[PDB]
């Protein structure tokens, strides 16, 4: 089965670093230079054994063909209104990128407004962020090449879809907010740096600045509106209040749901925007989140987590700003997380709640906060929404494990609010009635009850004979809610598989206390929760260890790699996508420094003591028992992943192959694939998505010897 040889990789035994008295060896530190011939040669040699391995079986061809078949369905974003026109994104099915469409009315003929597919031969130029002017006559949009986080902002006149000269460079992790006078737009950019800025470099991103761009001018003329040279990790995003009177500045440092909130009354500017604005520091600490919902004069509605881990709505009067004077509009729920809030039709609020990892959507009165209407949904997620203050209607998109989904429309001018199906798609060949979704709660090591979704064919015998695909993330206050995945459904239908998603701690499923439960010193809880999910699926007879595949991306890549090190006996197969593997060095590269609010930083002795215990790169260890080897492992990354620098995976696979792959008891493959012209994942063209999922389940099929079920 292993009809190849692992490439010889040079070990730099001199690369020894002292971490607070602990000596750490990093023999593959030279892989940190992406541009070197050594690194390029290493990548080439690895791809040379992985690709033939993945493609040897006709099962990949059968999966890709079926994936291409079943993924070929119409995909719509919500309709949204800007000015006198409606806009929406649409994919016929297999287009590399969705296309932005425009129509002059809800019943009128639609035409192409922005087609990103024509900007690249392989669909690797993607839209990343956009902002319409207040009156909807002008358009700003970000473009990213080859999956990099770097953005170029370009501009369009909407009427006639006319290209404008304005180009903004060095844009990354940026806001986009037009002042309501249409004169220009707020955005973020980074100062010039040495070396490259295309997404292949590893250079840390610091000193992000807020600029204002006056339309019709050169970027060189752009106004500097906020900077934090004493605080190089600070990031300030700007937005305009609904009335267009205030610029609100949300300043973040790290990834915790917290921000400073400064404001600038634009009326109070002496001569318009000409320099650093007269910021009024309403909230000048990082002790809570303050997310603008709406305002009425000086009374501002914010979604907050201040003393409310499940989130709530407060009113802050700018003329009476003390916390003691704040009014609680919609108090915190006992258990339900308030996911997001939008203001529509002047005085309505749309609240989205997460109840036991499922969405409910509600309409509330702005003045009192009182519940008015529940929008009836099935069990699943709200993944799209449209409806701002001046709008008199809402669009919202629903999805779930077995349903491609539905877009609903509701006219809010009507006395009795009737929401109707505006758009619906059904994937032919996938009979949703053949399958069921159950939610269970399994006890973790410490007795905590963890939610897990299980999707399987109806009527299966729980005798532990089915192959299983267990997914997890666990971090950064992210909630892994039900979603439609054709790729995972083919695994169920055509590979006889059971699919599982565990809502482990670190996520935001049960608020900030759930987040805190799997970060910093408590990070090990994530791995404990995920391992317990695996054991539950085994004990209940959904699967066996030799038939179980675990999967996660980025922070979830860290998850499955750590679980591989800690419990190799528990899994047959592990797929780690774009994973953070070097927990000691992660903070040094690109935006990695922002993740220390979840992980900690090896600069501190306390944090280093946490990190060394689970860091995938530093815990590759031959299993003590003779009957136990490492699971089959496939790492997936790409050369323009500047979110999680690919060196993470490169050093990890080298370590796996040397320490474990060399041993004679190891027959399970340990492989990496490094893609070109792709990045972390956002904006990845359909074609590449199909290639990836085909590789993944071809890896599973080969390593577990799974027959295709046509």
């Amino acid at each position: 089965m292993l009809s190849f040889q692992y490439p010889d990789v040079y070990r730099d035994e001199t690369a020894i670093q002292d971490y607070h008295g602990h000596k750490v060896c990093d023999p593959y530190a030279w892989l940190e230079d992406p541009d070197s011939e050594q690194t390029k040669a290493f990548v080439e040699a690895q791809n040379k054994i992985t690709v033939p391995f993945l493609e040897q079986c006709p099962i990949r061809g059968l999966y890709k063909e079926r994936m291409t078949e079943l993924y070929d369905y119409p995909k719509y974003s919500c309709h949204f209104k800007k000015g006198k026109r409606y806009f929406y994104f649409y994919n016929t099915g297999l287009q590399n990128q969705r296309v932005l469409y425009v129509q002059d009315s809800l019943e009128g003929e639609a035409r192409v407004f922005l087609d990103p597919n024509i900007l690249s031969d392989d669909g690797t130029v993607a839209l990343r962020g956009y902002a319409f002017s207040e009156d909807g006559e002008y358009f700003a949009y970000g473009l990213s090449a080859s999956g990099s986080d770097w953005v170029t902002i370009k501009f369009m006149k909407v009427d006639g879809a006319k290209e404008l000269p304005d180009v903004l460079e060095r844009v990354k992790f940026s806001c986009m907010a037009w002042t309501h006078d249409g004169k220009g737009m707020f955005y973020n950019a980074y100062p010039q740096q040495d070396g490259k800025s295309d997404g292949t470099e590893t250079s840390t991103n610091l000193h992000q600045k807020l600029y204002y761009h006056v339309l019709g001018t050169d970027q060189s003329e752009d106004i500097l509106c906020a900077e934090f040279p004493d605080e190089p990790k600070w990031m300030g995003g700007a937005e305009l209040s609904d009335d267009g009177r205030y610029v609100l500045l949300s300043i973040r440092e790290g990834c915790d749901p917290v921000n400073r909130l400064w404001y600038c009354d634009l009326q109070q500017e002496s001569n318009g925007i000409t320099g650093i604005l007269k910021w009024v520091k309403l909230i000048d600490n990082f002790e809570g989140e303050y997310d603008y919902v709406t305002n009425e004069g000086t009374v501002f509605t914010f979604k907050t987590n201040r003393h409310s881990p499940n989130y709530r709505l407060i009113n802050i009067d700018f003329t009476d700003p003390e916390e003691s004077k704040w009014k609680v509009l919609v108090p915190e729920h006992e258990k339900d997380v308030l996911e997001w809030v939008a203001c529509v039709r002047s005085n309505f609020l749309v609240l989205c709640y997460l109840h036991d990892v499922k969405n409910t959507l509600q309409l509330h009165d702005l003045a009192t906060g009182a519940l008015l209407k529940i929008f009836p949904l099935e069990v699943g997620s709200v993944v799209g929404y449209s409806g701002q203050k001046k709008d008199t209607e809402i669009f919202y998109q629903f999805t779930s494990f077995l349903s491609p989904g539905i877009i609903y429309h509701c006219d809010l001018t009507k006395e009795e609010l009737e929401p109707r199906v505006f758009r619906e798609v059904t994937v032919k060949g996938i009979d949703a009635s053949d399958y069921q979704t159950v939610q269970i709660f399994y006890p973790s090591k410490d007795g905590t009850k963890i939610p897990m979704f299980i999707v399987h064919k109806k009527g299966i015998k729980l005798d532990g004979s089915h192959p299983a695909f267990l997914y997890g993330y666990g971090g950064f206050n992210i909630s892994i809610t039900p979603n439609y995945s054709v790729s995972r459904l083919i695994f169920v239908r055509h590979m006889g598989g059971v699919l599982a998603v565990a809502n482990i701690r670190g996520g935001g499923e049960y608020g900030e206390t759930w987040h805190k439960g799997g970060i910093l010193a408590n990070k090990q809880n994530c791995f404990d929760d995920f391992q317990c999910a695996a054991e539950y699926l085994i004990k209940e007879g959904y699967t066996s260890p030799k038939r179980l595949t675990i999967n996660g991306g980025a922070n979830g890549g860290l998850l499955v790699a750590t679980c591989a090190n800690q419990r190799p006996d528990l899994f047959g197969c592990v797929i780690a996508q774009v994973g953070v593997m070097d927990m000691l060095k992660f903070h040094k590269y690109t935006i990695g420094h922002a993740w220390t609010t979840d992980y900690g930083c090896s600069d501190s002795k306390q944090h280093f003591e946490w990190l060394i215990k689970y860091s995938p790169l530093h815990n590759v260890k031959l299993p003590e028992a003779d009957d136990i080897q490492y699971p089959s492992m496939l790492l997936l990354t790409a050369d323009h992943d500047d979110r999680v620098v690919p060196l993470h995976s490169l050093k990890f696979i080298a370590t796996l192959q040397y320490i474990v792959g060399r041993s004679r008891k190891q027959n399970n493959p340990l492989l990496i694939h490094v893609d070109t012209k792709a990045g972390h994942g956002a904006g990845k063209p359909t074609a590449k998505v199909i290639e990836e999922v085909s590789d993944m389940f071809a890896f599973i099929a080969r390593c577990l010897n799974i027959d295709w079920i046509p």
Binding site: D149, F173, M235, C255, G475, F476, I478, A554, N555, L558, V578, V580, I591, A594, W595, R643, V644, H680
Partner: peptide, 4 residues
């Protein structure tokens, strides 16, 4: 959005 700059989370991993």
């Amino acid at each position: 959005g700059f989370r991993p």
